[PDB]
Amino acid sequence: DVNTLTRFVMEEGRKARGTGELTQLLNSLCTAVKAISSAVRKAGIAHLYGIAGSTNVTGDQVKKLDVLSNDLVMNMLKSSFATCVLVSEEDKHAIIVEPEKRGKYVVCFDPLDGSSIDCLVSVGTIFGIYRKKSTDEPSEKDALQPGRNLVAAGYALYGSATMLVLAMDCGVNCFMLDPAIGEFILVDKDVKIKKKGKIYSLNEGYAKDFDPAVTEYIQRKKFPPDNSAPYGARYVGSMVADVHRTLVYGGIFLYPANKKSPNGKLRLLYECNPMAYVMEKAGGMATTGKEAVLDVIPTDIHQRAPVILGSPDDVLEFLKVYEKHS
Amino acid sequence: DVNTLTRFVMEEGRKARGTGELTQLLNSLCTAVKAISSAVRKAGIAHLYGIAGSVKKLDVLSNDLVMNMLKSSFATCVLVSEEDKHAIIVEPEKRGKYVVCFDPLDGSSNIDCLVSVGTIFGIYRKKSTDEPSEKDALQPGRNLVAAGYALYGSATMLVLAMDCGVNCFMLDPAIGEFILVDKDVKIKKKGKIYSLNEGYAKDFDPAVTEYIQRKKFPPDNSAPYGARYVGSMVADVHRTLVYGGIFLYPANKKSPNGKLRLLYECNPMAYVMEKAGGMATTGKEAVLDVIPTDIHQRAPVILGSPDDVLEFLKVYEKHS
Amino acid sequence: DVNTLTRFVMEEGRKARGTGELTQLLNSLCTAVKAISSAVRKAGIAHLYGIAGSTQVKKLDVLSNDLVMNMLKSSFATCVLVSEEDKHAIIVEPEKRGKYVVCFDPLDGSSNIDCLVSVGTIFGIYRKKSTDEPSEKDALQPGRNLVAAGYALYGSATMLVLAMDCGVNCFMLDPAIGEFILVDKDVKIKKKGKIYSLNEGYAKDFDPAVTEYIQRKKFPPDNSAPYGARYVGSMVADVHRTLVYGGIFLYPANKKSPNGKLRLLYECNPMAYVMEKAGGMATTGKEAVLDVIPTDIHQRAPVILGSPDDVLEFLKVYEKHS
Amino acid sequence: DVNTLTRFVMEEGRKARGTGELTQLLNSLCTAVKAISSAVRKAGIAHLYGIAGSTNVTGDQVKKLDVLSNDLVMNMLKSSFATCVLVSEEDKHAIIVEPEKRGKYVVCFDPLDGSSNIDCLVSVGTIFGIYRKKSTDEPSEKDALQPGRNLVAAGYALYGSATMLVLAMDCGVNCFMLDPAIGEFILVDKDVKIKKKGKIYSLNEGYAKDFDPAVTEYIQRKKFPPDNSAPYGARYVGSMVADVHRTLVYGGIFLYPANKKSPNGKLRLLYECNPMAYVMEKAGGMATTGKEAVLDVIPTDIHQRAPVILGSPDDVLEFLKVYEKHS
Ligand SMILES: Nc1ncnc2c1ncn2[C@@H]1O[C@H](COP(=O)(O)O)[C@@H](O)[C@H]1O
Ligand SMILES: Nc1ncnc2c1ncn2[C@@H]1O[C@H](COP(=O)(O)O)[C@@H](O)[C@H]1O
Ligand SMILES: Nc1ncnc2c1ncn2[C@@H]1O[C@H](COP(=O)(O)O)[C@@H](O)[C@H]1O
Ligand SMILES: Nc1ncnc2c1ncn2[C@@H]1O[C@H](COP(=O)(O)O)[C@@H](O)[C@H]1O
Ligand SMILES: O=C1NS(=O)(=O)c2ccccc21
Ligand SMILES: *C(=O)NCc1ccccc1
Ligand SMILES: [Mg+2]
Ligand SMILES: [Mg+2]
């Protein structure tokens, strides 16, 4: 039987005996993602270039895509009546939802990662959903939960086609956007990552600054000590694209710490934790080098975290090299 | 003033005082590219998954779209594709003067991960009075009349290079129209990104090894280059065009003549690069100067910003 | 606040404190309608005409039927499905059965989709009332028993009109994102209109009451302004115009269609329910459409519907000739 | 072989041994039509209703869509470098193209009929007629005052259940269906011809009190055939493109005739009656005012009205028989 994201989410909510609040949140997020996808694929770009003359360009049309994407996710989540605290890459402080529209969920999101997009590189939206735990008035503190508290997480990849990957307790499920009908179609159910892959993914241009454990691990991939075939290298430079390839083909993805960047580069709350949760729910791993990403207790909603994630055998091999150097 | 691919191509054809044949070729290719884009973005995938209660692989469909649209243009006589072992000879009633070599959906082995994919094309005019044959496609890239690619990335863009320069068109899917968004584009003199599969490090020639070491540990103490390698040639080359820098697919052990195909991968990208003021070399000569003997022959390629390719060549010359 | 059909339907179901089954039905129907719209607008027609190499209205009607049927069966919310396209009622397989009975016209192309003007989808949703094994009899409920009804118009744009106890709401399909956007809330029809809609080619076969009523629209006895006439010949188009601008739509029995021409279960009853929920009226002449007790799933009915003042005026003419 | 409007127009221009100017005009018009269709189908309406936190449902969306459609046709035609004078239903005066962008052609068009048609959700359309400038005078409204017999090309786009473009030239009438998945008009009906006699009549019978006696009698004969043949069916959308296209596809007759209160009819000669009359005649149909062929009227005002009765030739000739009976 065909399944859509809308029907799938509704049915999981029925099975969970929920009140429909999380379902409304996810519905609203799915709608935002479809609107982001349409914009990313440059629908209406002819108006920006004067097809109707100079007087027919709107206000949305002229915003940069990462601004529009933030506006779309913020507005759709607020209007779901399911959220109380919203954390976005865009805004320094957590957004506290107006009291009339408050639900119990806290959403951390990256509205359009990779947009730094002029080369038409894949870009994506990343999200993580928590339940508020405090009895207090909602505040930024409610977003400072470890990733192991996540209720749902995932990403939309605007690549050759648009796909939403959604991870919950039931596992990881992949939905392809059919732009003819604006429906996400379930195409890969309960997906699991390979135990070990053959691809490694990191920016090797910064080799001069590598931690010695990273240097050694990468040397093992290119010159395997057991004379096995060297790993192939892929690095899109857009995390959603690199992580999704890691999920589908297996292997390892690294944005590790070093001496100049002791806490890595990627953002814990809305980049590392959602991807770590997807990976763990698919039978993979995600580590900072010293602990699981999902076990870090944040103190700052924009704090950075190192991340090495992917196939468990590959992450484990990295950790062995890391422990040798520690 | 707004401009479309259709209007732009038509006007350049009028300026050229042509007969309209190459214009019909380019219109037909534009239509094929829009149809490939639609399929790549998975329009209609709901029907494959049973929405109505119960299709070709994308690279096969893409080949069929380019082949059929080019044949029905009445502008072509020899068609070379990655998909077909032998050149396709157009039937007499539909024959025009142009030879087209193309890659209908480059990067599709990894399509499963939704990596950017693309279509690559190069167009030659047939020289002979002879009956068309596979040998008519054995021309050096210097003889190209037009070349370019369509990148199906975050958005779909067609890059078209001709004598008049390089022009970039964005597909607006709301109206199915390619809109001219970057005119007479030129690549940066020197970039800050290098692009190659470093998994082959063990098999690299010493010149490639040394060049990459220069990017990571610059001898003038400039900042190291960043690395990007999508693993789909159209994506990596387009990034090279837009941001500058260098792209390499040199020879290794599984590929001792390089991996990429001269006629429908290397030559079109080399032509785009040279028309944008960039460079494209095999190491020993310009890609566009290689005289092919096999329509599927491979070639090494190092291309991109001229100062970066020249820096590679300086290292290459030290080792040869 | 922007509102979508998906969000709207979900919230009404939360307020209803239902189990989510009717919500799943409506979500599945909304998806089917978006798929019909895409096909009606001829997405992919280039492939039918050979764009990739060598290697129809009825077929679009069949495809639309297949889309509604499959989306409804796979909803697990339905047990009996009556379609204009199928001679017999479809009984949902035991493992996929839910509580609801749906009568629908998936598309009205066979007729004039060759002129391209307008086609539409009409639906009416009932709860199964009997505890017997599911059969065509479960679709033989009076329209008064409807839980939800409505239509999609595939016109200059695609609009879905959904009527329930909460009233009538209109949603516009934004094809850029595949979302039905709420654009007209709790719609009510004008108490009196200035347009009449019927096929006057049947003039020779009209009964005297219809003849007199139409004469009053062209030659008002109070010498007020004559009504304008419009007639597309597609029920969704003609009824939607009646809802939006007011007036009256007639498809009466004539001498050659003595029981009427339109079909009660999936044309007259859904449109009668939309009209009544919007403050309008829908009569056969003898009784409210929604009060007719059907005996046969494809039976026909006369229908006169629209603004209440106009339908009441027709009914006074009708009683005069009674 | 598959054929697209782009390929078809280009090849007809090659056969004509033209300079490519009319081809560029037609390419530009096809692009405008695709853009109108996208807006008509309400792509992006979610943004108008606040999906990104900004609403703007102000004024009349129907009027704004007519104006946007005018802006699309105007700008695409101006930038074609193929036109010199542009007459639009939406503009009081003829638009004179700036000198640097002037080509040879004069275009009369109705860009959209949303505001004039109560059935705007049912169907809207674009109508166009293309002339060659006939004098070397500085361009002016007078360049658009040519009889329809002078048309080089004419046609319409119907934004109905699907979007179709109908293009008439000397080679005949050809019908193209827009495939929105790829933005391509696919040739689906070649060299089309109207039936000699139809079975449908189309007019607003709400005007019956004001009808000319000949119109009253003719319609009476369609409903009560003197020979007891089957009565005609009636259809009237109230959008000219929809009603005329049905007449082309199924045959029959469409009437917007003159009467004592409207002695020149209601529809406009330059961008409604003449393009439709040209499509009809190229399809083997007829188009009369009652007194002469629509295409032979020499206009004196760019917005002047003309009566029109068009469609299958046996039906139009029968109307003229009844019209003559009352003259
Ligand atoms: N659509 C859904 N999919 C999966 N789990 C859900 C869904 N809806 C609710 N739940 C679970 O039930 C809890 C309560 O739901 P709610 O009452 O909607 O906040 C959530 O926090 C989830 O653990
Ligand atoms: N649309 C066009 N754009 C650029 N150059 C063209 C075009 N059409 C023709 N030419 C040039 O004119 C030559 C002859 O054109 P043709 O007669 O169409 O084969 C081509 O090989 C090109 O060198
Ligand atoms: N989405 C909805 N919108 C309006 N009413 C609903 C909805 N869902 C359920 N209801 C009402 O609640 C009843 C029971 O719903 P269910 O348990 O889903 O069959 C329905 O028959 C309706 O009367
Ligand atoms: N694409 C075309 N289709 C049909 N006829 C054309 C076309 N292009 C040019 N013609 C004919 O040739 C004449 C001169 O064309 P042009 O030089 O483009 O103004 C036109 O006025 C038409 O009669
Ligand atoms: O695809 C089509 N659907 S349609 O019946 O309106 C039609 C009419 C004519 C040519 C093609 C087509
Ligand atoms: C305008 O585009 N739509 C309003 C309308 C028109 C006809 C019937 C119903 C609604
Ligand atoms: Mg039907
Ligand atoms: Mg108008």
mmCIF file of N, CA and C in Angstrom, chain D residues 182-226:
data_model
loop_
_atom_site.group_PDB
_atom_site.id
_atom_site.type_symbol
_atom_site.label_atom_id
_atom_site.label_comp_id
_atom_site.label_asym_id
_atom_site.label_seq_id
_atom_site.Cartn_x
_atom_site.Cartn_y
_atom_site.Cartn_z
ATOM 1 N N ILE D 182 7.182 20.187 -17.647
ATOM 2 C CA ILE D 182 8.360 20.607 -18.393
ATOM 3 C C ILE D 182 8.205 21.970 -19.045
ATOM 4 N N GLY D 183 7.059 22.633 -18.903
ATOM 5 C CA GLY D 183 6.881 23.928 -19.541
ATOM 6 C C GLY D 183 7.001 23.894 -21.046
ATOM 7 N N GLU D 184 6.315 22.941 -21.659
ATOM 8 C CA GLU D 184 6.365 22.729 -23.090
ATOM 9 C C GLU D 184 4.938 22.609 -23.598
ATOM 10 N N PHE D 185 4.609 23.350 -24.660
ATOM 11 C CA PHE D 185 3.338 23.184 -25.369
ATOM 12 C C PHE D 185 3.506 22.073 -26.399
ATOM 13 N N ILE D 186 2.783 20.978 -26.218
ATOM 14 C CA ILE D 186 2.889 19.792 -27.065
ATOM 15 C C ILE D 186 1.823 19.853 -28.150
ATOM 16 N N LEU D 187 2.227 19.665 -29.407
ATOM 17 C CA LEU D 187 1.251 19.667 -30.491
ATOM 18 C C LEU D 187 0.338 18.449 -30.356
ATOM 19 N N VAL D 188 -0.967 18.675 -30.187
ATOM 20 C CA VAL D 188 -1.905 17.578 -29.977
ATOM 21 C C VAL D 188 -3.011 17.514 -31.023
ATOM 22 N N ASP D 189 -3.258 18.573 -31.792
ATOM 23 C CA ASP D 189 -4.254 18.531 -32.864
ATOM 24 C C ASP D 189 -3.746 19.399 -33.999
ATOM 25 N N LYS D 190 -3.492 18.792 -35.157
ATOM 26 C CA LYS D 190 -2.862 19.484 -36.273
ATOM 27 C C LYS D 190 -3.883 19.859 -37.338
ATOM 28 N N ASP D 191 -3.773 21.084 -37.844
ATOM 29 C CA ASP D 191 -4.543 21.526 -39.005
ATOM 30 C C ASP D 191 -6.037 21.271 -38.794
ATOM 31 N N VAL D 192 -6.555 21.775 -37.672
ATOM 32 C CA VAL D 192 -7.891 21.381 -37.242
ATOM 33 C C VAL D 192 -8.935 22.110 -38.074
ATOM 34 N N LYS D 193 -10.062 21.422 -38.289
ATOM 35 C CA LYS D 193 -11.198 21.926 -39.050
ATOM 36 C C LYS D 193 -12.470 21.741 -38.238
ATOM 37 N N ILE D 194 -13.325 22.755 -38.265
ATOM 38 C CA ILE D 194 -14.589 22.706 -37.548
ATOM 39 C C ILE D 194 -15.597 21.884 -38.346
ATOM 40 N N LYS D 195 -16.496 21.210 -37.630
ATOM 41 C CA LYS D 195 -17.596 20.483 -38.256
ATOM 42 C C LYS D 195 -18.440 21.426 -39.105
ATOM 43 N N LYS D 196 -18.979 20.902 -40.212
ATOM 44 C CA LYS D 196 -19.815 21.732 -41.076
ATOM 45 C C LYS D 196 -21.083 22.183 -40.364
ATOM 46 N N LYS D 197 -21.640 21.336 -39.508
ATOM 47 C CA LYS D 197 -22.825 21.665 -38.734
ATOM 48 C C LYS D 197 -22.700 21.042 -37.354
ATOM 49 N N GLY D 198 -23.096 21.797 -36.326
ATOM 50 C CA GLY D 198 -23.021 21.352 -34.957
ATOM 51 C C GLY D 198 -24.390 21.146 -34.337
ATOM 52 N N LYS D 199 -24.380 20.938 -33.011
ATOM 53 C CA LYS D 199 -25.587 20.626 -32.251
ATOM 54 C C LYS D 199 -25.645 21.382 -30.926
ATOM 55 N N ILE D 200 -24.866 22.456 -30.789
ATOM 56 C CA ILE D 200 -24.775 23.267 -29.582
ATOM 57 C C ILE D 200 -24.870 24.725 -29.997
ATOM 58 N N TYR D 201 -25.661 25.511 -29.260
ATOM 59 C CA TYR D 201 -25.674 26.961 -29.417
ATOM 60 C C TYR D 201 -25.249 27.614 -28.110
ATOM 61 N N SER D 202 -24.653 28.796 -28.221
ATOM 62 C CA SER D 202 -23.985 29.427 -27.086
ATOM 63 C C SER D 202 -24.255 30.924 -27.115
ATOM 64 N N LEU D 203 -25.055 31.410 -26.168
ATOM 65 C CA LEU D 203 -25.233 32.843 -25.958
ATOM 66 C C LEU D 203 -25.875 33.061 -24.594
ATOM 67 N N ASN D 204 -25.799 34.298 -24.102
ATOM 68 C CA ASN D 204 -26.430 34.650 -22.823
ATOM 69 C C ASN D 204 -27.913 34.894 -23.071
ATOM 70 N N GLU D 205 -28.756 33.923 -22.714
ATOM 71 C CA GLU D 205 -30.191 34.081 -22.934
ATOM 72 C C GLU D 205 -30.848 34.969 -21.887
ATOM 73 N N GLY D 206 -30.088 35.452 -20.905
ATOM 74 C CA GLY D 206 -30.630 36.450 -20.007
ATOM 75 C C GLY D 206 -30.901 37.778 -20.679
ATOM 76 N N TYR D 207 -30.286 38.024 -21.835
ATOM 77 C CA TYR D 207 -30.575 39.209 -22.629
ATOM 78 C C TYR D 207 -31.827 39.056 -23.484
ATOM 79 N N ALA D 208 -32.593 37.970 -23.314
ATOM 80 C CA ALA D 208 -33.675 37.657 -24.249
ATOM 81 C C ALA D 208 -34.646 38.820 -24.429
ATOM 82 N N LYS D 209 -34.946 39.556 -23.352
ATOM 83 C CA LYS D 209 -35.875 40.682 -23.467
ATOM 84 C C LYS D 209 -35.376 41.734 -24.451
ATOM 85 N N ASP D 210 -34.063 41.836 -24.630
ATOM 86 C CA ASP D 210 -33.465 42.833 -25.506
ATOM 87 C C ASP D 210 -33.086 42.272 -26.868
ATOM 88 N N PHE D 211 -33.298 40.976 -27.099
ATOM 89 C CA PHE D 211 -32.871 40.347 -28.346
ATOM 90 C C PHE D 211 -33.479 41.031 -29.561
ATOM 91 N N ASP D 212 -32.672 41.136 -30.606
ATOM 92 C CA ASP D 212 -33.190 41.369 -31.942
ATOM 93 C C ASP D 212 -34.193 40.272 -32.296
ATOM 94 N N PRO D 213 -35.301 40.605 -32.969
ATOM 95 C CA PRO D 213 -36.261 39.559 -33.372
ATOM 96 C C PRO D 213 -35.643 38.393 -34.131
ATOM 97 N N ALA D 214 -34.603 38.630 -34.937
ATOM 98 C CA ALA D 214 -33.968 37.529 -35.656
ATOM 99 C C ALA D 214 -33.264 36.567 -34.705
ATOM 100 N N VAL D 215 -32.644 37.093 -33.644
ATOM 101 C CA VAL D 215 -31.987 36.221 -32.671
ATOM 102 C C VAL D 215 -33.028 35.403 -31.920
ATOM 103 N N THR D 216 -34.114 36.052 -31.492
ATOM 104 C CA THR D 216 -35.205 35.334 -30.846
ATOM 105 C C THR D 216 -35.688 34.170 -31.705
ATOM 106 N N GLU D 217 -35.941 34.429 -32.988
ATOM 107 C CA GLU D 217 -36.472 33.374 -33.846
ATOM 108 C C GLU D 217 -35.449 32.269 -34.067
ATOM 109 N N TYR D 218 -34.186 32.634 -34.307
ATOM 110 C CA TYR D 218 -33.171 31.611 -34.549
ATOM 111 C C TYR D 218 -33.017 30.694 -33.335
ATOM 112 N N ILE D 219 -32.944 31.270 -32.130
ATOM 113 C CA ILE D 219 -32.797 30.441 -30.935
ATOM 114 C C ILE D 219 -34.049 29.596 -30.715
ATOM 115 N N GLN D 220 -35.226 30.162 -30.991
ATOM 116 C CA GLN D 220 -36.452 29.370 -30.926
ATOM 117 C C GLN D 220 -36.367 28.150 -31.831
ATOM 118 N N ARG D 221 -35.768 28.306 -33.017
ATOM 119 C CA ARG D 221 -35.625 27.170 -33.930
ATOM 120 C C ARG D 221 -34.609 26.151 -33.434
ATOM 121 N N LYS D 222 -33.618 26.578 -32.639
ATOM 122 C CA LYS D 222 -32.691 25.611 -32.054
ATOM 123 C C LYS D 222 -33.367 24.771 -30.979
ATOM 124 N N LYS D 223 -34.301 25.365 -30.239
ATOM 125 C CA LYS D 223 -35.014 24.679 -29.166
ATOM 126 C C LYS D 223 -36.224 23.904 -29.655
ATOM 127 N N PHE D 224 -36.899 24.409 -30.691
ATOM 128 C CA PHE D 224 -38.123 23.822 -31.231
ATOM 129 C C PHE D 224 -37.926 23.706 -32.735
ATOM 130 N N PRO D 225 -37.132 22.739 -33.182
ATOM 131 C CA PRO D 225 -36.801 22.645 -34.604
ATOM 132 C C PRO D 225 -38.053 22.466 -35.440
ATOM 133 N N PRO D 226 -38.254 23.316 -36.451
ATOM 134 C CA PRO D 226 -39.484 23.214 -37.261
ATOM 135 C C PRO D 226 -39.673 21.852 -37.904
#
